[model samples]
Target: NPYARGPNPTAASLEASAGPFTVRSFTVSRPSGYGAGTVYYPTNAGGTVGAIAIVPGYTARQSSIKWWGPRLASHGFVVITIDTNSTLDQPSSRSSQQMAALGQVASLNGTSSSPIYGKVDTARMGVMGWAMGGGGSLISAANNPSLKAAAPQAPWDSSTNFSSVTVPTLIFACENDSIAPVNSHALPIYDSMSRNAKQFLEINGGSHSCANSGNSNQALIGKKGVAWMKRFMDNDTRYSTFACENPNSTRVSDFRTANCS
Candidate 1:
């Protein structure tokens, strides 16, 4: 595939701490609409790659979702992890900042002085986040149907109606979450999208922060997130099975998928 990068994917490769590509990152000197950001990119991806923007939940900082930067970047993606303009920002506000972070990534790709100059495929992009930021990711996909993919964890929004989101999405749910319980937030949101590929993976006995940084299930969660983006953003069919198939692991309490093969 024109968009494919690195070597053939394997279960172990996807579950490893990093991928084949070398990674480098830099802090955004003057962030656009967000409070601050750190951009991570593959230094030896051999070609331009998709960009993905991630945000933290309510009253959280970039550290809450920082792990995804290197995890996705090393696997051949341009990733940006950002802090909201305000820790208490609502999902709508976080949504706006998330898109702004992506916009900055696009701008950096063209700036001659930028380290990531000419390294990003602006046409292909994805969104991800934690809690309210996770809800923001859904909002981003809803507002921008052209987005290549989305994967949000422990997402919480004021309303659960995301029927307008047509972007391929993968939701990470914490089975034991009390903040945004799976039954009310994750499952209904997953059920509302009938027009696109979607999946729901609940971490068994996980708390609200199950998918965040310092979580123990990186092997599964990271693999799923990267595979989802690769399958949809790069259209690399090599990831089809990894992206759509049930993990069938004990770490996952519940799983559901539709419109994917």
Candidate 2:
């Protein structure tokens, strides 16, 4: 098992201070794929940690979603924030790149000269993204059932019929996302996910990038994301309360989950 275990720290504690590990990041290139991305991992997680791959949306780049790197890495995960081959790449393409990012880390885990060598639990992985990228995460989960978890923010998909996805998922919905209106995007897709552990968190009056860096909801968002990934990706039952219980904070307009264990 990873360093973090049961009787998990409260979501509040997880965010009140940075985690036990110091964070480090690096860049990697996939000659056959898109531009490139950064990988963030904890230097002191004590053992191989679970990994997560994240992507940004249409016309967006890794910078748009890079904050997740440190936030997640410091908490005992290896997070990769990627840039698609094309900024305009849609869900399917983004999904491919996200998987590619995950593969890159798995490859690095065995590279004798790499710092992250033998530092990742290749069998435990997760995917996440923003907007179209978020939609792509769902698609990735649908296409790759082996993924342990998925968390998409203000997700938008050409088709919201991700009803067949079985991977545990958490969707962060922006209450006022005119771009990918919640009614049309986050809500419907979340409602369609009936076969596995799932959660929907509607940030009160949040916008498209509500959960991004420098946001007011960072505290709650950070806690939820970390907890969900730890609970599902690492199978760390300690985070059950953090993953299954509602925040009940005023900032959260709505919160719901099903099949969390």
Candidate 3:
């Protein structure tokens, strides 16, 4: 594929903490609409790549979801991890800020002085987050159907109706989450998307912070997150199995996929 970068992926390669590309990051000088942002990009992705904007959960900061910046950037994406305007921002507000962060990333691509100038494919983009920010991701997808992908972890929202979302999504659920239980939040949200490519991966015995920074399952979770973006954003079928197939590992308590061959 014209958009594909890096070597043909392998289970071992994808499971690693870092990918082939060298990574560099810089804090946004002016974070439009969001509190702050750290943009991570690959030095040699060989071509323009998609951009992904990530946000943290309620009462959280960038530190919670910062791991995804380099993790996805090293795998050939321009990732922005952001802090919401307020620690208590609701899902709707977080959704606006998330997209605004993405807009700023696109703007950076056109600014001659910027590090990511001409490095981003603005048309292809993705959204991600944790907890309430995870719900924001779904809201972003619902509002912008053109988004290439959405992969939110332990998402929480006031409502469960997301039948309007068409973007390919991969939800990382924590099996024993108390903050935002998977049964009522993640599973129902996943089930509500009846007309799109989607997956549910619940970490066994995981808490609300299971998929956040400092988690032990990076090898598995990291691989799945990147695979989902690659498969959907870049349209790289090289990640088909990794993105769609179940890991069948004991670490995962529940797994389900739809509309992915």
**Each prediction's Cα lDDT score?**
0.96, 0.88, 0.96
Candidate 3 on 149-232: residue-level lDDT in tens? 999999999898999999999999999999999888999999999999999999999999999999999999999999999999
Candidate 3 has a TM-score of: 0.99
Per-residue accuracy of model 1 over 56-133 as CA lDDT, tens digit each? 999999899999999999999999999998999999999999999999999999999988999999999999999999
Q: What is the lDDT of candidate 3?
A: 0.96
lDDT of 2 by residue, 1-261 (tens): 444633358656667546667899988844235568798998988778888999899999888888899988888899989888888899999998899888889888988876789999999999999999999999999999999999999999969888889999999999989999999999999999989899999999899999876678778888899889988988888888888888888888988899988
RMSD of 1: 0.6
Residue 49 displacement (Å), model 1:
0.3
Residue 178 of candidate 3: its Cα lDDT?
98
Q: What global local distance difference test value does model 1 have?
A: 0.96
Off by over 4 Å in 1: none
| Candidate with the larger lDDT of 1 and 2 | 1
Candidate 1, residue 47: lDDT: 91
